[PDB]
């Protein structure tokens, strides 16, 4: 397949007045690992992040071309961006290539910078958004992560438990996908602090 | 996917499911397949979701631009002629199959539009993957000049038939009722499927996950 | 004569003469209360034959943005269309209704497109753009030059100086949308060369519910010095 | 100077656009339009100087659609162009949107076309006025006029041509009394206006009358055998 | 000044270039055309400036289609061009709709091409008026004239050029609506010989063309045996 | 017109565009070792003007730069979008911030092309730029309508620039210029040049550029933060009048 040429895995999960996002740290060609500190989560503001799994060329291209538009936006505008609007910006950016598509399936997670209610979204490679209220996944291990988040997720979760949930899903999912792993990184973002952790994961 | 429509004695009733798949796997559960076109015109969409979203959005903007110059209420023929003229220009590469319905000065109209630019105006239309199950109900139970609740029951039966006999449909039934003096968008209308209550608990306590690195970054 | 030419003093003369066409159009009032914005103007006809329910000096751009002008109506109908398109472009990209300041910027860009080429004259209109975004009212004033100004209250057209001093002496905050309409009509009554009827003026307001052009009944209500 | 090319003057005026209103009076003819409760009428005079012309070709009334009719006043060649553009726009409206164009919208489309000629120095404006008529779904009969500058408005009655002020005085004097408007009263009013301002004692050959009604919304140009019926009734009272 | 461009108005709404382009038609030789009961007949006062020119040079009667003819007065290059446009109009009409173009429609399509030159600064107006003439079993006989401004009207008889007044004053005497083409030929030649002035300009040639029943909707140059039989009548009617 | 020389090798439209800036508001900049600042005067002074914006004449171009303008304002709104596009194109191409001189060259190459190519008018705008880069540190530039940029330590553009320049020549203390010193000098230069006396805080606009923990900062002083700067000026020149 196409997106399995580089691999990847991204997850997002909400709490009560908080949200999380996680990704694996591997870069490799078809079956060979090249690098173990590859970036797949990109900040798009304070209390707002985006994650990208797919073809690495398209990951970097989409991130750079989106930061372009975001910087011009918040310069013309006098305000930081809402997540609902970043979702539509990405949808437009991807649907402009409806027949030349970027091979990415982004995942967004953030807090509105006035009322700080959490937000999580998912998009396809041509920009159909998907605003769930429990969790979203994208990558090569999507079924394996659906199976974990369906069983472990609970409605109201403080950050100490949300971290455990989004970590125990990612670890046990990427431990059954051959082209995803070699580390897992997690971001927890609240009104007052953004916490960031790398986890003890298998490197096989 | 499963979408349907009818024309009853006073207006229009539309219906749709909420499931969205990417393969043989369920991605969304509470999708919204009934789209705003005008305060008197709504549309249901099957096929490639992004195509339907962008097409409906564009025709919505163009009608909000037409009605604002005219100062009048839009018509359904105008939306139909926009949609079909675009989809014919793209020769089917836009996978937008639609069920469009509204109420204007001439009365209630209902259309089905196919991605190559063919159109059918009929008193009842179905579309999606559960089309055949829906029409199996419409052919057996449809009558002209029906009431509002009879029509709503019929459409709910059709969407439920599409749900419980097709694999790509499920998880809810939405409706929209349109008349000359009212509009009622019903999201959700019935919830025929509910996940099972879980017996065991797997809440992970602080410490079960091992960490190598930590960072904090205060904000205000 | 030419527009791509400076004077030795450093002035653009055709722009100054396009503003003279704004300074000779029908008056237009603008007031920004705490919970709304008012737009009022003189819509007077040269005979009893003109049907006044066919053309409008107060027009909506969106649910929450509206316009008036002073000067040339043919020029106004172009900028109305352009603003209505730009709002829809913004919505199509971001799926959020356009803020009132970005529309003013993008419309002054259109007015500036017509100031730099030869073979084109500038617009003979100034605009007043009311809005309600982020729980706050807004009022701007776009000019043919490509320049905009945010106002708390102002007046354009014939007698736009005394009509503005009247506001300087008869306007404050801690108002609401109903005390401001009375002040706007009083500011139009200065220049009204005749009896003010419900059909000789045209009023539009914006608030939390959005923009609306009032009806002749509502105009006749407050034309009695009522509210 | 400030009168040759479409630039602004120190007093904020466009003189080449004012001079296109003066070309309307070069044809030497006057048009009148009147609105009723169930009808809308247009009237103009038909002046052939030669007996060698075919009177069938000498007309200023035109069919834009089956339901919309026009009378054009001014330079004769400009009017045919504006009429063909009106027809093209009316046809493309229905091709695009699926219903017949109103008069309210066709008028402003022509006006939008005319304003570009004032804002761009490519082409000259057209020395022609235009009065349209048509029956609307909810609004009823409509009478609309547009200018070389891109101004447009609806009317109860109006005129275009040389005797336009002394016609709009007659019309505003008759409109205030607000009698029970009818087909016959409307046509009589129009013919009496054109007779008073010209003082000519019309024949059926010297005028052409187009009408549109709520009963029959189709525009139809009248015959000499049907104008005589209305002309005879005038001499009575 | 106010009289140097066709994009310019005067303070009384006049465009003087279009009038100056008609002044050029007034200074050209005279052509007439008369609509009969069963056809149309064109006649032209063709001036021979030099004896070195062949008999047949500067033809001012043109075939625009196999059922339409054209007579011109003014600048001749402009007329040849407008003939070339009137030909491609009728060509594309048959190519798109599949039948012969009517003359009321061809006249409009050429009138608009002519009117387009009255609006711009980069072009002048055309310096030629011209008549078109056709015959069909359904549409009947038809005669339209088109001016530089872009005006187009139908006619029973018409003239263009120097002796316009003198020629229509003779054409109104004719009861053309009663007659046939072979009888109107005599009248056409008689008028051209009446209005021609031998002292104002040198000798001339008579040029005639037809369309009607007797040609079966085919625009033709008149044969010689009839043109001479009419030129003779013209001479014998000059005893007046 | 601008595509025509004079016999004495002159270009008079380029001079008229430069004369079209004295009609505009005064804007000065002051470089320092702790940072760099701008100071514009608000001629938009009226009892009914709202002041909704963050700032009316200070425009932010990047995370490490801002600018102030004087002249035609439509032209300024054009150039401020072009600047923001150049910066983001550089970022997209290299993923590093653009230095504070390449941007000025890139805008001056646009301004030069309007004095040279047929039917278009030179931009009647001068600009000042303040910013930071990892090559030369804090910088201050000054553009002219002809496409001529120059680096400065303190300059002034607009109305009464030739007087503020003479003051800065006689009160700038190169090598010992902090940011408080620069603001104290700004409140002085901007009071001995404004026609309207007493220098109301409503009639000015100030922005400072500084660095904190390896991040760049561009702030805008509020009303109450400028009232103190004003009050510490009449006290200073009242003491220079005590010694009579």
Short mmCIF file of C-alpha atoms in Angstrom, two decimals, chain C residues 21-209:
data_model
loop_
_atom_site.label_atom_id
_atom_site.label_comp_id
_atom_site.label_asym_id
_atom_site.label_seq_id
_atom_site.Cartn_x
_atom_site.Cartn_y
_atom_site.Cartn_z
CA UNK C 21 -18.86 63.22 -5.22
CA UNK C 22 -19.32 61.63 -1.79
CA UNK C 23 -19.68 65.07 -0.19
CA UNK C 24 -22.68 65.82 -2.47
CA UNK C 25 -24.74 62.66 -1.99
CA UNK C 26 -27.67 62.12 0.33
CA UNK C 27 -26.89 62.27 4.08
CA UNK C 28 -26.22 59.10 6.04
CA UNK C 29 -25.97 58.68 9.82
CA UNK C 30 -24.12 56.10 11.88
CA UNK C 31 -24.24 55.51 15.64
CA UNK C 32 -22.68 52.70 17.68
CA UNK C 33 -24.63 52.10 20.88
CA UNK C 34 -23.59 49.59 23.54
CA UNK C 35 -25.86 46.78 22.27
CA UNK C 36 -26.23 47.68 18.60
CA UNK C 37 -25.42 49.89 15.64
CA UNK C 38 -27.80 52.12 13.67
CA UNK C 39 -27.67 53.10 10.02
CA UNK C 40 -30.02 55.76 8.66
CA UNK C 41 -30.13 57.74 5.43
CA UNK C 42 -32.31 59.98 3.28
CA UNK C 43 -34.28 58.10 0.60
CA UNK C 44 -36.21 60.88 -1.14
CA UNK C 45 -37.74 60.73 -4.62
CA UNK C 46 -38.22 63.36 -7.32
CA UNK C 47 -41.92 62.51 -7.83
CA UNK C 48 -44.86 60.50 -6.54
CA UNK C 49 -44.33 58.06 -9.43
CA UNK C 50 -41.13 56.45 -8.13
CA UNK C 51 -41.92 53.19 -6.33
CA UNK C 52 -39.80 53.30 -3.17
CA UNK C 53 -40.28 49.59 -2.38
CA UNK C 54 -37.99 48.55 -5.27
CA UNK C 55 -34.52 49.93 -4.46
CA UNK C 56 -32.72 50.17 -1.13
CA UNK C 57 -29.92 52.33 0.23
CA UNK C 58 -29.71 49.98 3.25
CA UNK C 59 -28.65 46.49 2.16
CA UNK C 60 -27.49 43.33 3.98
CA UNK C 61 -24.20 41.57 3.25
CA UNK C 62 -24.74 38.70 5.69
CA UNK C 63 -26.95 37.88 8.67
CA UNK C 64 -24.75 40.18 10.79
CA UNK C 65 -23.31 42.85 8.43
CA UNK C 66 -25.04 45.73 6.65
CA UNK C 67 -24.34 48.83 4.59
CA UNK C 68 -25.26 52.36 3.68
CA UNK C 69 -23.55 54.83 1.36
CA UNK C 70 -23.36 58.44 0.24
CA UNK C 71 -22.81 59.26 -3.43
CA UNK C 72 -23.43 57.08 -6.49
CA UNK C 73 -25.79 54.11 -6.40
CA UNK C 74 -24.39 52.47 -9.53
CA UNK C 75 -21.01 52.41 -7.79
CA UNK C 76 -22.71 51.10 -4.64
CA UNK C 77 -24.23 48.08 -6.39
CA UNK C 78 -20.75 46.87 -7.39
CA UNK C 79 -19.31 46.98 -3.88
CA UNK C 80 -22.43 45.33 -2.44
CA UNK C 81 -21.89 42.38 -4.79
CA UNK C 82 -18.15 42.24 -4.08
CA UNK C 83 -18.66 42.29 -0.31
CA UNK C 84 -21.31 39.57 -0.53
CA UNK C 85 -18.88 37.42 -2.54
CA UNK C 86 -15.92 38.02 -0.21
CA UNK C 87 -18.00 37.05 2.83
CA UNK C 88 -18.91 33.79 1.10
CA UNK C 89 -15.28 33.10 0.17
CA UNK C 90 -14.35 33.54 3.83
CA UNK C 91 -17.17 31.22 4.89
CA UNK C 92 -16.20 28.63 2.27
CA UNK C 93 -12.63 28.49 3.57
CA UNK C 94 -13.19 28.81 7.33
CA UNK C 95 -16.92 27.94 7.75
CA UNK C 96 -17.17 30.92 10.15
CA UNK C 97 -19.03 34.19 9.40
CA UNK C 98 -16.62 36.91 8.32
CA UNK C 99 -15.67 39.51 10.96
CA UNK C 100 -16.66 43.09 10.26
CA UNK C 101 -13.05 44.33 10.08
CA UNK C 102 -11.77 41.76 7.58
CA UNK C 103 -14.60 42.64 5.20
CA UNK C 104 -13.68 46.32 5.46
CA UNK C 105 -10.05 45.46 4.70
CA UNK C 106 -10.93 43.26 1.72
CA UNK C 107 -13.38 45.87 0.39
CA UNK C 108 -10.91 48.74 0.74
CA UNK C 109 -8.59 46.50 -1.28
CA UNK C 110 -11.23 46.50 -4.04
CA UNK C 111 -11.57 50.28 -3.78
CA UNK C 112 -7.76 50.49 -4.04
CA UNK C 113 -7.69 48.30 -7.15
CA UNK C 114 -9.49 51.19 -8.90
CA UNK C 115 -6.94 53.87 -7.85
CA UNK C 116 -3.71 52.60 -9.47
CA UNK C 117 -4.49 51.89 -13.14
CA UNK C 118 -5.05 54.32 -15.94
CA UNK C 119 -8.32 53.96 -17.79
CA UNK C 120 -10.30 53.53 -14.56
CA UNK C 121 -11.88 56.10 -12.25
CA UNK C 122 -12.22 55.54 -8.48
CA UNK C 123 -15.55 54.92 -6.82
CA UNK C 124 -17.75 57.90 -6.04
CA UNK C 125 -19.02 56.34 -2.81
CA UNK C 126 -18.09 56.09 0.82
CA UNK C 127 -19.54 53.26 2.89
CA UNK C 128 -20.61 52.71 6.48
CA UNK C 129 -20.26 49.09 7.58
CA UNK C 130 -22.05 47.91 10.72
CA UNK C 131 -21.55 44.56 12.40
CA UNK C 132 -21.92 42.44 15.52
CA UNK C 133 -19.05 40.01 16.15
CA UNK C 134 -17.60 38.58 19.38
CA UNK C 135 -20.24 40.19 21.57
CA UNK C 136 -19.23 43.71 20.50
CA UNK C 137 -20.59 46.17 17.91
CA UNK C 138 -18.53 47.69 15.11
CA UNK C 139 -18.83 50.60 12.70
CA UNK C 140 -16.35 51.50 9.95
CA UNK C 141 -16.15 54.03 7.12
CA UNK C 142 -14.51 53.02 3.83
CA UNK C 143 -13.44 55.72 1.36
CA UNK C 144 -12.59 55.71 -2.37
CA UNK C 145 -8.89 56.03 -1.55
CA UNK C 146 -8.72 52.57 0.00
CA UNK C 147 -8.71 53.92 3.56
CA UNK C 148 -11.04 52.95 6.41
CA UNK C 149 -11.80 54.46 9.80
CA UNK C 150 -13.49 52.95 12.84
CA UNK C 151 -16.05 55.34 14.32
CA UNK C 152 -18.28 55.56 17.35
CA UNK C 153 -20.55 57.90 15.39
CA UNK C 154 -20.23 59.91 12.19
CA UNK C 155 -22.14 61.32 9.23
CA UNK C 156 -21.42 61.40 5.49
CA UNK C 157 -22.83 63.37 2.57
CA UNK C 158 -24.45 66.79 2.48
CA UNK C 159 -23.84 68.81 5.66
CA UNK C 160 -21.56 66.11 7.08
CA UNK C 161 -19.87 68.66 9.40
CA UNK C 162 -22.79 70.13 11.32
CA UNK C 163 -24.35 66.67 11.40
CA UNK C 164 -21.16 65.48 13.11
CA UNK C 165 -20.95 68.35 15.60
CA UNK C 166 -24.56 67.54 16.53
CA UNK C 167 -23.36 64.03 17.40
CA UNK C 168 -20.34 65.37 19.30
CA UNK C 169 -22.74 67.44 21.45
CA UNK C 170 -25.60 64.89 21.58
CA UNK C 171 -24.04 61.44 21.88
CA UNK C 172 -22.47 59.34 24.63
CA UNK C 173 -21.99 55.74 25.67
CA UNK C 174 -24.30 54.05 28.21
CA UNK C 175 -26.94 54.22 25.47
CA UNK C 176 -28.89 51.38 23.86
CA UNK C 177 -30.22 50.67 20.38
CA UNK C 178 -33.46 52.62 20.93
CA UNK C 179 -31.99 55.84 22.33
CA UNK C 180 -29.59 55.89 19.36
CA UNK C 181 -32.26 55.67 16.65
CA UNK C 182 -33.90 58.82 18.03
CA UNK C 183 -30.52 60.58 17.87
CA UNK C 184 -29.85 59.37 14.31
CA UNK C 185 -33.25 60.59 13.09
CA UNK C 186 -32.66 63.90 14.91
CA UNK C 187 -29.31 64.15 13.11
CA UNK C 188 -31.06 63.53 9.79
CA UNK C 189 -33.79 66.06 10.63
CA UNK C 190 -31.21 68.87 10.40
CA UNK C 191 -30.87 68.54 6.61
CA UNK C 192 -34.40 67.30 5.80
CA UNK C 193 -35.84 69.90 3.39
CA UNK C 194 -39.43 68.94 4.10
CA UNK C 195 -41.70 66.74 6.19
CA UNK C 196 -40.00 63.48 7.18
CA UNK C 197 -42.27 60.56 6.29
CA UNK C 198 -41.82 56.82 6.77
CA UNK C 199 -40.99 56.56 3.04
CA UNK C 200 -38.46 59.42 2.83
CA UNK C 201 -35.83 57.63 4.97
CA UNK C 202 -34.50 54.11 5.42
CA UNK C 203 -33.17 52.54 8.62
CA UNK C 204 -31.22 49.41 9.48
CA UNK C 205 -29.95 48.05 12.78
CA UNK C 206 -27.60 45.26 13.87
CA UNK C 207 -27.49 43.43 17.19
CA UNK C 208 -27.07 39.96 18.73
CA UNK C 209 -29.90 38.71 16.52
#
